[PDB]
Structures are given as C-alpha cells and as structure tokens.
C-alpha cells in the first residue's frame, strides 16, 4: 500500500481500504498517518470524504491516542481547508459540535461552532445549522444567547426563509413570558411577505393572539391582515 | 462513513470469496457541570473540618 | 462618482426629469399648554 | 461513487485540464494579451550615412495584415456600438423624456440608482 | 431594522414591625 | 385617462421628426472648403474639443489627404499631448495606410513623451510583434524594464521570451526582476518557471538565492514574515518531493533558528511533520500551535470565556510553568466593563472560581488564596450594583477550612450588610446549621425576613427549625407572629397557607383544642367560605365521638350559612352534611339532607 501511495496510484477508495485494514489490525495510530498522507493529494471535493472518515475514526475509537487538543486541531484544519474551497461542510460542523459537547461539556462552545457553520449557496444546509444551533441554545443556554442567535438568523436569512424563524422567535418569547416582545416580533414578521404567500405566519399570529391577546389586540391583528392584503 | 467506509466494508466482505480459494436553564450550566467535581471535593473537605469543629 | 446635477431652478436643455429628481419637539410647549389649562380651570372654579 | 476510483494521477490530469472598475494599465495589458491571442490565430536593419535614418526590412504581407486587422477590428467595434445604440433607442420604462438627448440623460440618471 | 423592546418589559417601612415582632419572641430552650 | 406620462410621450413623438453627390473635382473642392471652414471655426472657438479634433482629422483621412490629417493630429497634440485616445487614433491612422515608419516615429515619440503610460508601450510592442520584428520587441522590453516599470511590464517581458522559447532570456529577466521587484511572489515566480522550463540544479540554486537574499537583507525588513514563511515552506516541500527529506528538515531547523519570531514558519513545520515526520514530535508542536491559536483568539476578543476555559486547560496540561501568569492575565483581561449580572459577568466569575480552586488544590497556599479573596471581594465585584452569592459562600467555606470561623461569620455578616441576597442568606443558614450553632441561625432568619418580608418560603422555615430544636412553645409563638397583623406584607393566600402549615404543626403536637381555635381563626380569615366550613367539619371529624363532632360541625356550618343569608351557602352546608353522612354516618342523615335541600333556591 505504501508503494502504491508513493507512486500516486492510490485511489480514494483504496486510501480508505488501507486505513480500514490498519484499523482492523489494531494499528489505529498508524491508520491516521494514512489519512494524513493521502488527504492533501486529492481535490477538496474528495478531501471532504476522507476528512469525514479521518475525523469519525479519530473521535470514536478505543485505540486512538489523540489528545483533545489534537482532535480540535484536526477539526479546525478540516473546516479551514474545505470552507476555503466552498465545499459543503455541514457534517464536519455537526461532528465538531458533538465532539465539543462530548470532550469538555462546553455547550456554549458547541453552539458557537454551529453558528460559525450557519453564518459562513448551500442554503438548505445553513437552514439546518440555524435550526440546530437555535434549538440547542433554547434547550441549554437560555435567553441571553438565544436572542442573539435569533436576531442574527432573522437578519441574515432572506424573506420567506426568515419567517420560519420569526414564528419560532415569537413562540420562544411567548413561552419565556415576554408576550409584548412576541407580539412585536410577529408584527415584524407579518410585514415581510404578502399574506397571499405568508399563511404560515398568519395562522400562528391568530393562535398567539387567542392564547395571549384579547379582543382589542386581536382586532388590531385583523386590521393588520386586511391592510397588508391591500 | 457513508461515502468511502461503506464501499470499503463491501470490499472486505467480497474478500471472503477470495479467502475461500485461499484456503482450498441557567446561562452558566456548562461551566457548572465542568466545575462540579471540584466543588464537591472542596465541600467534602469543608464537611470534614466542620465535623471536627 | 459625482452625481449628475439636476437643477430645480434652471433647465437649459428643456429636459423632462422624474418629479423625484426635480423636487422640533420640546417639552416646554406641553408644559406651557398644560399650565394654561390649569390656570383656566383655576379661574373657572 | 464513480469518482472514488480515479487515481491520484488521474486527479492531477483532470484538475489541470479542467481547473468593480478597471485601471487603464490593467485594461492595457488585457487588450495586449487579447491581441496576442488573435495573432496566434493568424500566424535586419540598415543605416544610411547621408540622411542618418535607419530602415527596417519589413514583410509587406505582414504590414498588409496589420492594416487589415486594425480596419476589421475598428469595423467590428463600430457595428457593435451601432447595435447597442439601436437597443438603447428602443428600450422603454425610463422616466418620461421629450427628445433623444433627454432620454439618454434620464437613462444616465437611472444608472446612478444602482 | 428589527427593533424590540428591552428584555423584561411586560404587557400593559415594615422593617420596624418585623424587628419588633422578632424581638418579642420568647427565649429559646436549646433542648436539642 | 390622460396622464403626465402620456402627455410627454406625445410630446416626444411630436418632436421626433437630401443626399447630394459630388460629380467632379470642382464640387469636391467646394465641399472640402465648406467642411474645413466649419471644422476650423469650431476648433477656433473651442480648441479643447479633442473629439472634434479627431473627427476633423478623420475627415481629412476620408479625403485621402494624409498630409492634412497628419497636420490636424499634430495640432491636436499641441493642444493636449496627454489625451491617450488622440495618440492611439493617430498611430492607428498611420498604420491603416501602411505608413509603418511614420507610425514607428510616432510611437517612439509617444513613449518618449509619456513613458509611464503602459498603453503606449503595449501599442509599440504589439505593432512590432505583428511585423515579426522579434529583436525590436526585445529591445523595446529591455528599455521599458530598464525604466523600472510595474510588475505588469516584467511579466509581459517574461511572456515574450517564453513565446520565443528563450529560456536563458527568461533566466536573465528574472535575475533582473527580483532586483526591481523584491516581493516574494517574484522569487516564487522564478522558481515556478525553473520547475517547468529548467533543470533541478537551477531550481535548487534559485531557492538558495532566495534564502541567502532574505537572510542577508533581513536587517532591512523588506519581506513580511508571511512571505519568508511561504518561501521556506515552498523550498521545504520541493525538497520533500525530491525525496531529500533530510535537506528539508535541515532547512526548517536552520530557518527557524535564524527567524524564531515567525509563528507561521513553526506551523509550516507542523504541517510538514504531520505527513512526513513522526508521532513523537507532532504533539508538542500541536500544543504550541494551539497555544498560539488561543492567544490570537483571546487577544482579538477578550470576553470569549469559553476559549479562556480551553486556554487554561491547554496551559495547565502542556506548559505547567506558565499556569500562574496566564491566570493573572485571565483575571485582568476578561474583567467586564458593564455594571450588571449579564452573561459576561456570570461566565467571568467562574474563571476566578477556577483560579481559587486550582490554588487551593495544587498549591495549598492558604496565604495566596486569602490574598485572592481579598482582591476579588474588595476590588473587582461592584457590590453597590450586584454581587455573586457563590463567591461569599466559597469564601466562608475556605475560611472555615482554615479554622478562622469567627472571621467567616464576620465576613458573612459583612456580605449581608453590603448586599443582601436570597442565596447568600440561604447558604449562610445552611453553613450555620452544619455548624450546629442553632441559636445563631434564628438570628440569621430575622435579618432574612427583614430583607424580604413577603415570601412565605422564609416564614415556613422556623417551623421545622424550632421543631428540630424541640421548642414547642417557641414554635407556637413564631407561628402566631407569622400570621399576625404585623406580616401584612404577605398576600392573603400566603397567609392562609402559613395558617394551614401552623395548624398542621399544631395537629402534630396533639394540641386538638389549639388546632380547633386556629381552624376557627382561619375560617374567619377565609371570610366564612364554604370550603372553610368543610375544612372545619373535617378538623372536627379528626378530633363515635368523631361522628358526633362531625354532626356538630354540620350544624355549625348550617348556622353560618343561615347567618350569611346565602342560599348557595345553605346548599353547601347540606352537601357537607350529606358527605359526612356518606363518610361516617348513615342513610338517615342523607335523607335529612334531602329534606333540607331547597327547591329550584327556596330553602324549606
Ligand atoms: O436572588 P436569588 O433568589 O438568591 O437567586 C440566586 C442568584 O441569582 P441572581 O444573582 O440572578 O439573583 C444566584 O446567582 P449568583 O448570586 O450566585 O450570581 C443563582 O446562581 P447562578 O448564578 O449559578 O444561577 C442562584 O441559583 P442556584 O441556587 O442554582 O445557584 C439563585 O439562587 P436560588 O435558585 O435559590 O434563588
């Protein structure tokens, strides 16, 4: 195998075949040397697959002796190199967040890593990273961080994409008890799109006003709807 | 995994055919979690001293 | 990039341009007005 | 899954076979390079004593080709601008105008809103 | 620009008596 | 409908509204005279109209009178010799009529007049190259480059010699180009050339020139560190490709020795060693690289306390001699500017707590730790605005650890004084309970209830406190004070809850009569609610004497309902009587309740 690699006849499937041969023979620490010897040779589009294999083996394998600062060094190297070439790096960002939760338990660092992924064109992936980053912040980090993530996600994403997060922000504020902030968040969200193509916010606006508003505010919502339709 | 390890596992399975011929809420929750064992150790040292008193 | 000048007084070539191209709060006032309302009520009563 | 089986050598081959505003110096170099590309598609001295001027033994065929290349590129540029002017003279949506120069002025004003 | 009200906005001498009452308490027996 | 837009379209259409031939020389002369008079008139009135000058020259070109056209161009150059389009038009006019020597004389004048205008040099170059005058093009580039032009001219000269396949010429040009333009991209352009168009002996010699140059000229600081780093990395990777890993290793060692201040060079050695080196030397370099990365992230953003925690882990894991210093930086760098318990202060205080815990565990330096507590409490935390309860409780635990318990109580009283806090009081209470000085805990509780008098949470604690102490009389007095009129700051529901707790406590002590008195008081507090009457009946039932007491309580409930003159109260009393009959009575009392039931109410 080493002579194939030296001759530059190694193919991505064979570079993984060698690494899996070594891992099956408990020579895991030398498996990583295969990945590092081969990743630089291929274009970034294939470096993505080999990086996924390398990091998945490094983070979860009983024989790997990589210290946590080494595994972080690998992760940061992967994200810097691949994002320097525009390759979708969603899986590496998710794996990095999971590893950061595992090794140290710093949820705040895990969320910030996901936010780095969502803020950096693969719009569906950035919507998945915004949903995971925000849900994790809601579940573990509370308002002081959740608000700074929501008001960035809404600000960055275009219309008809940020509306999903306007409804989610309003629901978060309604649960946290700031009903007025939720009402004005939904008021901001209603203006983003014509109600003909914006029903998703409008039925949740009706739900919110029935749950937390009253007759005079609900009538104001209806005024808003008919004014917006014109 | 799905891209290259999935193919290579098939390769290591196809080699069995060759082997046959071979043989034939808190905003600081996370820091609290990290720092908890040290707090517990310090609390036990306090308990021992306060029991001495 | 210096914008092209469009004058609101002069039009040497007789051009036609879009209308867009051709075309204070102090509490003392409220305080005064309410003082005069109070004085009016004082006298009226 | 078909791309996982190319050697490193094949990736080197494939990656080498298929890898606002401009300053006048940069535009000049680019125009020079374009003219050299065009040339690639197409392709002694003596000094007198009495007058002192030097003469160069040029190829009259190359001098003809040069004059023709300059005439044809001027012609091509002129016709391209002529078509662009007809397009400008027929497009609509710009603010009301009363003559052609007023139309060109309103279009210029519209380009500032970019 | 998405302008929000600040976080926390919502929709829409007894110390002497406490001290006197505490001082009126009976003495403790410490029977434990 | 009429519109202003429609009106103006009609104006536009309203306003938007002969080909003579020349048959002989006389008519041509008339025409040319008229045209020349026109053009000369305009140029006389406004000589600065360069466009008109060019159009007049072109008109003479169309008359085939090159002498007149030349004169017009010359006169225009007299007006403005800086207008590049005029020069270019004149040169093109000369070339179009095949007057190559006039065009040459003119292009030489142009570059002599405006040598810094690249367009004129490129015009001369492309003209001579079109005529296959390779040696003239070469002499032109030699002069241009001798005038020290920008990198574009040098790149073009290299491209020219590459077209000529004159590899020695390209070496000589690069030999001059690195002097004219010392930037490291120029040296890397030369090595990039020698790799594809030259032997390896030359490639090594050019890399050696590059390093010897940056070494000798280092004292001028011409190159930035990133440039030298790219030069060294490129040279090392090139020697690694040539299988001479030993010479790349020597290169990295000697270069790092020469320029220790370049972090990018150390990182390049890490990148090289991770794929061509060994396991042992990789992790120490990775630790240093991560130290630098955390340092960069922290200097860019000092309030990133997640990275502070990781940075402290890295330094105490790999560089034990730098632990204390980096702590003294974390304290002073990350301290917040604000004056509120926002997330930054809450996360900052844990760096201080980690510093304290580390000192206590790994050094046992009680003097230093006491100095740290003094610095924190007295200086850093803005007590007048807020305080962290955990800090003072930790100070108390440490102080008790070192036998200064009176000083621990002193600092706790001080903590109460400067900033009362619910958690501070709770922790003080907890610690004093563990101290088993129970008599002091109640004096703590009075300060607590002074701090915030409305919460029943504090009010309920004296119950099980004095119950643990066994003082029944003190507990009863405290309970009576809790529900007394002096506690009007508590809500009505809270007062009822406290009364219920006191009633349960009295029932625990088998004081049935006092329990009944308190139940009557609570019914008075409940404004004689029917639920209060039901609770009184249940309490009587808990006091066959229970059944008789329940019957008496039912009679009392009926009397109270009648006194309130409420039919709903009477119905509630009847339901209570029926429930007592069902629970501890018989069907006879249920029938009596049916008789007392009012018709749809009208009591009978
Ligand atoms: O005012 P309290 O009712 O006593 O609340 C305190 C206090 O919260 P605040 O400072 O926001 O008032 C503590 O914060 P610190 O004083 O220590 O800064 C907080 O601790 P955390 O900062 O860790 O959240 C603690 O909660 P906990 O007891 O879980 O430590 C909580 O005490 P209570 O929950 O008993 O009210």
PDB file of C-alpha atoms in Angstrom, chain B:
ATOM      1  CA  UNK B   1     -18.775   6.783   6.814  1.00  0.00           C
ATOM      2  CA  UNK B   2     -21.479   6.678   4.111  1.00  0.00           C
ATOM      3  CA  UNK B   3     -19.177   7.543   1.200  1.00  0.00           C
ATOM      4  CA  UNK B   4     -15.938   5.542   1.463  1.00  0.00           C
ATOM      5  CA  UNK B   5     -16.203   3.359   4.570  1.00  0.00           C
ATOM      6  CA  UNK B   6     -19.438   1.928   3.178  1.00  0.00           C
ATOM      7  CA  UNK B   7     -17.673   0.878  -0.033  1.00  0.00           C
ATOM      8  CA  UNK B   8     -14.631  -0.456   1.789  1.00  0.00           C
ATOM      9  CA  UNK B   9     -16.747  -2.619   4.089  1.00  0.00           C
ATOM     10  CA  UNK B  10     -18.144  -4.206   0.940  1.00  0.00           C
ATOM     11  CA  UNK B  11     -14.585  -4.785  -0.264  1.00  0.00           C
ATOM     12  CA  UNK B  12     -13.671  -6.549   2.981  1.00  0.00           C
ATOM     13  CA  UNK B  13     -16.805  -8.650   2.508  1.00  0.00           C
ATOM     14  CA  UNK B  14     -16.044  -9.556  -1.107  1.00  0.00           C
ATOM     15  CA  UNK B  15     -12.619 -10.766   0.006  1.00  0.00           C
ATOM     16  CA  UNK B  16     -14.355 -13.699   1.728  1.00  0.00           C
ATOM     17  CA  UNK B  17     -14.819 -15.096  -1.777  1.00  0.00           C
ATOM     18  CA  UNK B  18     -11.075 -14.833  -2.283  1.00  0.00           C
ATOM     19  CA  UNK B  19     -10.463 -16.385   1.142  1.00  0.00           C
ATOM     20  CA  UNK B  20     -12.391 -19.489   0.111  1.00  0.00           C
ATOM     21  CA  UNK B  21      -9.942 -20.028  -2.756  1.00  0.00           C
ATOM     22  CA  UNK B  22      -7.079 -19.033  -0.454  1.00  0.00           C
ATOM     23  CA  UNK B  23      -7.665 -21.890   1.966  1.00  0.00           C
ATOM     24  CA  UNK B  24      -8.638 -24.507  -0.637  1.00  0.00           C
ATOM     25  CA  UNK B  25     -31.968  26.898  32.055  1.00  0.00           C
ATOM     26  CA  UNK B  26     -29.019  28.600  33.709  1.00  0.00           C
ATOM     27  CA  UNK B  27     -26.837  30.679  31.433  1.00  0.00           C
ATOM     28  CA  UNK B  28     -23.784  29.080  33.108  1.00  0.00           C
ATOM     29  CA  UNK B  29     -24.972  25.471  33.165  1.00  0.00           C
ATOM     30  CA  UNK B  30     -21.971  24.134  31.235  1.00  0.00           C
ATOM     31  CA  UNK B  31     -19.327  25.740  33.453  1.00  0.00           C
ATOM     32  CA  UNK B  32     -21.288  24.482  36.453  1.00  0.00           C
ATOM     33  CA  UNK B  33     -21.133  20.957  35.051  1.00  0.00           C
ATOM     34  CA  UNK B  34     -17.398  21.181  34.380  1.00  0.00           C
ATOM     35  CA  UNK B  35     -16.620  22.676  37.794  1.00  0.00           C
ATOM     36  CA  UNK B  36     -18.935  20.427  39.816  1.00  0.00           C
ATOM     37  CA  UNK B  37     -16.438  17.711  40.940  1.00  0.00           C
ATOM     38  CA  UNK B  38     -14.010  20.314  42.272  1.00  0.00           C
ATOM     39  CA  UNK B  39     -16.858  21.908  44.217  1.00  0.00           C
ATOM     40  CA  UNK B  40     -17.811  18.502  45.617  1.00  0.00           C
ATOM     41  CA  UNK B  41     -14.231  17.814  46.741  1.00  0.00           C
ATOM     42  CA  UNK B  42     -13.992  21.222  48.408  1.00  0.00           C
ATOM     43  CA  UNK B  43     -17.365  20.625  50.064  1.00  0.00           C
ATOM     44  CA  UNK B  44     -16.194  17.289  51.488  1.00  0.00           C
ATOM     45  CA  UNK B  45     -13.052  18.951  52.857  1.00  0.00           C
ATOM     46  CA  UNK B  46     -15.301  21.571  54.454  1.00  0.00           C
ATOM     47  CA  UNK B  47     -17.536  18.862  55.885  1.00  0.00           C
ATOM     48  CA  UNK B  48     -14.597  17.072  57.476  1.00  0.00           C
ATOM     49  CA  UNK B  49     -13.293  20.271  59.068  1.00  0.00           C
ATOM     50  CA  UNK B  50     -16.736  21.429  60.242  1.00  0.00           C
ATOM     51  CA  UNK B  51     -17.355  17.989  61.761  1.00  0.00           C
ATOM     52  CA  UNK B  52     -14.041  18.383  63.556  1.00  0.00           C
ATOM     53  CA  UNK B  53     -15.405  21.640  64.996  1.00  0.00           C
TER      54      UNK B  53
END
